[PDB]
Amino acid sequence: LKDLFRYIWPKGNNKVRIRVLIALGLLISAKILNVQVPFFFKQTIDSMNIAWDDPTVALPAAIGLTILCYGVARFGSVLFGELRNAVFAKVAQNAIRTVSLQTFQHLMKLDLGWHLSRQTGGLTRAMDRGTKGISQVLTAMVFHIIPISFEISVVCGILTYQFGASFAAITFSTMLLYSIFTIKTTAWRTHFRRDANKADNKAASVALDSLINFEAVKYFNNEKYLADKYNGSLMNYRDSQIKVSQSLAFLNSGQNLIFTTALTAMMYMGCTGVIGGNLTVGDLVLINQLVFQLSVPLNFLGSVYRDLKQSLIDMETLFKLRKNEVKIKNAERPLMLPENVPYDITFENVTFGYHPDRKILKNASFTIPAGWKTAIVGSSGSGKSTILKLVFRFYDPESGRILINGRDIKEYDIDALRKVIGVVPQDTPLFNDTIWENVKFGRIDATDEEVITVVEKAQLAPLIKKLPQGFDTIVGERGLMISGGEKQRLAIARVLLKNARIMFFDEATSALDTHTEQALLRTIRDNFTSGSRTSVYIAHRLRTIADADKIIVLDNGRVREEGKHLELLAMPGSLYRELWTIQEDLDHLENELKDQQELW
Amino acid sequence: LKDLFRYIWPKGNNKVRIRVLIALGLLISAKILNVQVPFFFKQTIDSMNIAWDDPTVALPAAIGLTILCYGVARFGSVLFGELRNAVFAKVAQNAIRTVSLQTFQHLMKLDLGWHLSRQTGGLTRAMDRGTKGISQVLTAMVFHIIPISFEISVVCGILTYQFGASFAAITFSTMLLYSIFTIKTTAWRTHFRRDANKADNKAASVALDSLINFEAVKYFNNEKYLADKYNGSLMNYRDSQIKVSQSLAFLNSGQNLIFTTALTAMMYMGCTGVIGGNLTVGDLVLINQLVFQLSVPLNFLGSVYRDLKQSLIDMETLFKLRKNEVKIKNAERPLMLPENVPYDITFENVTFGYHPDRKILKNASFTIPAGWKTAIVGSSGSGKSTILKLVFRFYDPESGRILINGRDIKEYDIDALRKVIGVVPQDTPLFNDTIWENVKFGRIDATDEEVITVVEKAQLAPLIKKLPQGFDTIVGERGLMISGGEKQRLAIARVLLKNARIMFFDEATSALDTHTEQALLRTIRDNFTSGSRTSVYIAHRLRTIADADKIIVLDNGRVREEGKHLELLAMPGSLYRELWTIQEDLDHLENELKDQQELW
């Protein structure tokens, strides 16, 4: 909770400290007035208790002022309460915004392993729950607990000074009883609510499972059994809600019984004190009204405490996400790439594996030269979908040297590297947003003319104008769903916008159509063919790897051989030959079977 | 709303009428006491306002009784309120149960078209919303509206008889003002809450779309843009909640201002009436306390009215689902099948189509003889997945005669028919329940020994004992997910339990493995081969249709020819030949390509 008091009382920002002190003053004055009200009511009652001789005179001003003060005190108490609410909301929402944004800025900075291990739904639920918890905690600790505590103290002091300690004793005892009673009975009612929600979700699941499969529900005549299961679940839910209502009745009745006993006993004490000439009827009114005022705001407090501990747990969970440490950090003396010459990714004595038990890439030592569209190939598990993650600095090498331009990779700024490293991923994503925004994603700092030029260069205009809304469609799960080729050309356009020196085509064409694959390859070779773009195809369908100036083969996480397609295909025993023959026969059978299918 | 007053005041059930009258009596007495309380307080104040001469006497009993009556009246008012709540809950939940069950009993009785047109999520949401609406309507119309109306009337009568009409005028005017103010300001606050929820869902969607695609968020360095979108959405949400809190402050402050003006003006009227020797200070107390009691329960009522109209709309929607009419009804003079001889499904001059525009099955006239495992075959759209729906009486024939045993189908009881008509559907369903229950589904009135015998006959025991929990696994979407063959043998076991005379295998093997298909066929031919089970295979893979005694071919929704496999395959020009050759070459290429794949 300390970090919370750090987000609402920081070091340096005076605006927030002042807003908080103002909320404090408003709270204090609100309670002062809520307690002064009865005193004006009593001064009224004790100024009217005279023997009026002339029943035609006007109301003296000494009493009109008292009545007016009574009214303005009521109004001012409630008003200051609500103003405190408004102000401290202005504060708590700033705190929530700040913490959520700092957390999200961290997550975008952690390593990848910490994201692949953990679940995303869990992270989002944690953020939401911790935020609601901060809100509820500040609420219940400024709106319901601190004010009522101040009021109880003021009331006990009033009743101890004016009349005696007996009233303060009775009031504090009543408060203790009310509190513990409410807490325990609320636990009880929570058990009942849990049971009810369970038995309602059950019935809903049954109704669903029965209406979706109506055909099978009727193919066997089993509709009465379903109605009976539904009746049983509904009866359980009925009984549970019955018990919930009865328990709420017990709760409210017991609370009112407690406060009624307090008020009645205090009326008796005041009525036996009046006999001693000490007090006056106005004092009975004062006591009853003070205690009832104490009673008014206690329902809410007794309710909220139920939720405070879960909210504190959620807050701790959330605040924990920013305590995690980053392993991939900008090593000392960050630099900037030469950014004036071609680039290389020469490896040296590399050894890397996700989990330290099963190494995937072993003693690899190869060379990605300058301006030569190298091609990696192997098996899924032979360490070819990992070169990217290892050059993009998502992980580090275990006793390995990722040498770029004769200089290690752990010496540059991770961002100065990731900014000149572009990728065409296998299954590109699409945010729940437009298609113009998802393509601006490549370089937000772009002019719309550049965006349209690249969208046309990627052969996408025929597919964007074909849609209902021009450049404003809604893509993603929560919207339109386009197929593979479109997504791949979209990712290609993103890359075109990035305009990087080194490109990694991570299986751009994994599961698509033959002619769509050929179109993608044609576009890629028409755009990414200059002699100033180090290209690297992480491919497993050699049908596309024919023009590369260096083909690297990885078996059992080790480099085997190099050379051009025709060069090594003619070499005895090379895996290139077996793989090529297998893929060729596979494509033969594939296209033949597809022709047969479209026949049928 | 009338039907509601029919479900809580039926004709014949005296228990419910009596429970309701008791709730009524409790409500009335609760308000009587909540209004008598101040009179005891005033009798107290006006009995203590004496000149006590001996300040050592005890409290007379004439005042102790008054104080005790005051306390028991408070407690009894609240107690009767809560008892009314409990009782009318005991009633409303019975009503909810009854209406939900009757609705679900109807849906299981409607035709199929009404289910295929409409959406299931919509039906379930409608049921849930209408149920919550019934609950909320009864609540707000027995707990918040009727009681406060009775109390306002009683208060106006009291203040009109005892003192004068001015107080009743002020009180009723105050109530009008409070009501309309609360309504309008609540509409306002609802607008603000809508905006806030929108801008929070937006931010959550952004966080999701950014954490799921973290790889692509980093492959382009676009994390600051994401943080900025998040900051913008969070700022909108912040401002919206600020305005919500300020508006709630305005609301509560205005309400308290209204009631404060009422109380203060009434104190002034009472204090200028006391001058006329008419009233006494106790009357000022009486007035203030009565009006404050009126004020206490009004927040809730002012809130709920927001939700009452949507709830009435939901109730009407729900109650509408039982007004729909059934077209497939048990025609006059329902009968029972002979149930002592083999069965036939001889058609005659049939003509049927889902939508009257595009007929699918035209002038069909064929014969499904007794004990002959007939086989239908054609194209998906040639009218072969419809013979079932038309013999199972999910639809009716347009100028067609579905003759069974020389007698029409519209003459028997739909259930006496559906009970001797079993089906093995293509994609069988699985409820979110066990595997022993989903197999008991076939015949709930079965002995566990029969269930296990058939589960073994279906060659399923190897697949039920292979799982963690024996006969108690959790299947379905919300649980374990088994593959095709298991589901098909499960549906087969269901049928085995039904033990019907006529069976329809509706593409039992559509998309499975070769050996799994052969195993399913072997099981089916081992079980369903007796000479007393009219079998009908609605199949499109003739590789299984070789042993049937009658193969029917449907082209363009018309019967073409008949005969045994070898009989018509040797016939010139028969579609059987083309289809057989195509499927054979297709299976050849399929298995060859699969061998090639498992090579690679």
Ligand SMILES: CCCCCCCC/C=C\CCCCCCCC(=O)O[C@H](COC(=O)CCCCCCCCCCC)COP(=O)(O)OCCN
């Ligand atoms: C999180 C926990 C924090 C706990 C902090 C609680 C501290 C409060 C403790 C004790 C306060 C009790 C003081 C009451 C003494 C009684 C004085 C009194 O009776 O005066 C009342 C009105 O005062 C009034 O209106 C009573 C209100 C006066 C209270 C002022 C103290 C607050 C100052 C701010 C403290 C941060 C009027 O009485 P009268 O008949 O008009 O004349 C009597 C003499 N003038």
Ligand SMILES: CCCCCCCC/C=C\CCCCCCCC(=O)O[C@H](COC(=O)CCCCCCCCCCC)COP(=O)(O)OCCN
């Ligand atoms: C959905 C809308 C339905 C609207 C129906 C509302 C009908 C109510 C209309 C008028 C009722 C006003 C009657 C009050 C007359 C005043 C009588 C009165 O002052 O008696 C009060 C207590 O009575 C009391 O405690 C006051 C409560 C008595 C009320 C009894 C009437 C209810 C009967 C049930 C009706 C269904 C005590 O006054 P006291 O000083 O002790 O002596 C005066 C004479 N005994």
